[model samples]
Target: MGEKQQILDYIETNKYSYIEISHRIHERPELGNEEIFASRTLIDRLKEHDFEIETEIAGHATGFIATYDSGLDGPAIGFLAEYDALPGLGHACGHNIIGTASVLGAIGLKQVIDQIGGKVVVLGCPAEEGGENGSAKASYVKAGVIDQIDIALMIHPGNETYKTIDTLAVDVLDVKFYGKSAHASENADEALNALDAMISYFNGVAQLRQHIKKDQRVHGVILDGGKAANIIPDYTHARFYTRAMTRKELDILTEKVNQIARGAAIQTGCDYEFGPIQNGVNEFIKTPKLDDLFAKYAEEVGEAVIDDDFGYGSTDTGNVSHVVPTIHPHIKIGSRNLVGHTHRFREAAASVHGDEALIKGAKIMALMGLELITNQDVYQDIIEEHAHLKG
Candidate 1:
């Protein structure tokens, strides 16, 4: 297990360039499919590893796939990476870490594939933040971008190194309200107030929380509260993120949310409609078998980290978990005191601690890729157990 450190050092020597990749992206923040600079940088770096490059894998101009096949009969191991950053906050969410870590992870696996033997895929996926929910990855997965992959492996940048027990299934809703506009004082009676409708809907959501499970959550913001203070603003629009432990609960709660908007529409004399804005991402999808092996690989690489508590966050990786007995653990790069998805986190992501963590992450993932290719029974068990785990 410790023998892999040398391989990790080689990767670390080359990792600064990729970590710089994450840093460069942070300076010029691109939203979702608009990440031209970051996407091109990833493609150029990946090509050096002898990995076959495919740009725009599923119509998303920024989405890419780096495929390395050793022509050896073995399981396909995947490392999922996200390059998209938040709109205003940039890499505050630590996506920059995910991108560079997994990209180098693929490089390290390619370094040892001949000795270990297997398929290694480093997926550069786009649109993780709420700014533009990752509908592209969802489309690609459904259309078989990762159809042949047997298992998935990746890590997120967090304050602590642990496994997420539940990344709630998330769905976005677009609530729109329309009403008649007229002079405030002269024709106030004839005019309709859409702002009132929005207010009423919020109250309904506040009440809805009492019936939901402790794991379930719903949070939203008003995208367009109103136009002006003079005449009644004709429209009010908002976006809501509804989360739950299971998709069924997510589905059931959405309808109830819509009902609130509907009731508001009737009371305020406004026309309201709930649109299917975007499908939710992330869920509880880990395996006792793969989890155990990942722990061994971590220890082997001198990564002293263990998950002692429940993990709560949403990720597209949940879709992969539904297919394979997957494990996407969080590795500590800096401090648990530093919260994720903040400017402080972005700074920490590129700090000395972050770079060291990236090297360790690459080594651990590469070693696990080695195990999946070398050991057949474990691979088969992961696939079988994963197949039975209901989504």
Candidate 2:
């Protein structure tokens, strides 16, 4: 039997087991950087398969890295798992499916490791929901955890099935204004209104919105404006999120926002501070070679995969793509009418459709990793393709 078939049969045989893991995660949804139960569950399962596990990867308490070395020299393929849930909604982004599918892919690869002669790593990436200062992949990039990975792949549960996705570059800014306070009625002239400076900053951003590109976005909220109406507010703060189609564009927009900050302080006679609230997620970088492999396998699995890239959302997986050959493809777990990060999608995340997606997702990721690590020519093609895209 072909290697693909062999892996497929193994996945088919153990499909229900992985589905249960996905369901369990959905049942007990935890927020970003707080995924204790889900991470432990996946870690224990990998240990059962004899995969050497390392917990607390990238200084994240819930993050982990599990590996199985074939004792032969070849490529080190990485599969990413995200188990973070939304604030009030549970598994609204289908991360339970994403995290479980990655674990299954790592286990499924074991069936062909001896034949393929490579290493498999299931990277437990946490806080993919934008709560932490940086994503798990971003921390890994800073710590050099992904330096050895030749290729990376993961599946996301989305409304559509596609081999490629369009994601934007994003960053968070924490803005603060410092000013002296005095009695509003008696000593108004002596007080420097921080709230007025904040208002100026908000208007400045409104002016900036008209000039940015169609894909670029700049939005924020007033986290602090003042303590009381009777006194001239001494301090105020706000947080803003800026995004663009590419990092270069984001940088350009960031500078414009900084100008707004400076201008606000100049007009209001209040000192201000601007700093990053989060390290932010980069725009997704696509690997054409990996994209083609995903398309082929998606067709083989009878998935109705679309050729064109669709939709946009920032992801920590984008950090991984910039480091190595990567593809953050999607598997259909719900109909097009069902969007993510909502109650409707949360229900579908653990439904029978989600179960079906787990089966295909595991197969697609396993096959993509297997084909590349096992074949020298294909592996080199992917490497060269990645370099070309990065360049």
Candidate 3:
């Protein structure tokens, strides 16, 4: 058998271990850097596969990296794995598969990389669900941590794979409305209601949405609404999300959305203040060459694999890709019809089906990682393809 097949065969033997780990993680959900459950589970499984673990390498508490250095000089390849689950809806985004797939890929390479010779680094990325700004590999991208690496690859669980998907650039703002409140019966007219001001803001934003691009989206929720309904809510706070196709688009639309907030204050004659809390760009473009490599390997393991011709949801990884060659290929474990960010998807993340997903997804990921480390021509093509791509 060829080296690649032998490695695949080796991965197949240990696939169940990763699956059980996936389920263990799914059973105990953690958020962002709080993935103690996932991190420990991941490290233990890596130990089984003989991968060295460095816990909390990044500024993040749960962020870690697994390395299997072959004692050879070659191109560097990086893979991303996320284990953070959604709030109130555990594993709904299918991060268990993401975490295990990457773990399997990186560990599977450890056994055979020395024979072929190269470097494989697996990054345990924290807060992919938007907790910290630089918490992702992109944070290191600016800090000069990733300069040692030649390329990056990752697989995410989704409805389907995406050759070229657009993650909308997103920004957030917290707005506060202030007004005077008095006794309900004493001087109803004299009291200025902040809640009314917020309502007016929502209405103004609804009108503003019509003028923005079809892709532009603005949404928010009320964070606070005064002491009691009878006292004329004198203070109210709200947060909003503004998204566009690019950071430039987000900037333009952010101005327009602020205008909506201003209109609310003016309409209600209430004191208002607006400031940005979070700002992020849309998902960067994926190179056709690298995406095809992920897909080619995926098809080898599946009955059929499909990436969306259209587009999909947003991810902080989108922020990472804009800086370098990145792939967020979808890894399907069960029920293609099961959508993400829902309870149904969360359940699948822990089911036996979820375990099966961990094994299959990891095998393909390991194969792709192997190529990135050893296949010089393929690595050169990926680099050349991404180098020509302009932001």
Top TM-score: which candidate number? Answer: 2
Cα deviation of 90 in candidate 1 (Å)?
3.5
Cα RMSD, model 1: 2.8
Q: Give one digit per residue, the lDDT tens place, for model 3 in 1-391.
A: 3777877877787677677778778888898778888987877777676666777654667877777778798766677888888899988988988888887877776667788777777778877776444345545554555665566777776655445466677776888999888778777789888889999988888888779888888988999977775698888999888888887788889888777778788888898988775335455766788888877887787725663464656776676676667877666656768888999998877777666666666777678777876778888888778778743
RMSD of each: 2.8, 1.6, 3.2
Cα lDDT, all candidates: 0.77, 0.87, 0.75
**Predicted candidate 2 versus true structure: per-residue lDDT over 21-111, tens digit per residue:** 9999999999878899999999998999999998997779999999999999889988899999998899999999998898898888877
- For model 2, the stretches where C-alpha displacement exceeds 4 angstroms are 2-6
Error of 1 at 83 (Å): 2.1
Per-residue lDDT over 130-206 for candidate 1, one digit per residue giving the tens place of the 0 to 100 score: 44445555656666887757777887877877654566778878899999888887898998888889999999999
Pick the winner on lDDT between candidates 1 and 2: 2
How far in Å is the alpha carbon of 164 misplaced in model 1? 4.3
Instruction: Arrange candidates, best TM-score first.
Output: 2, 1, 3
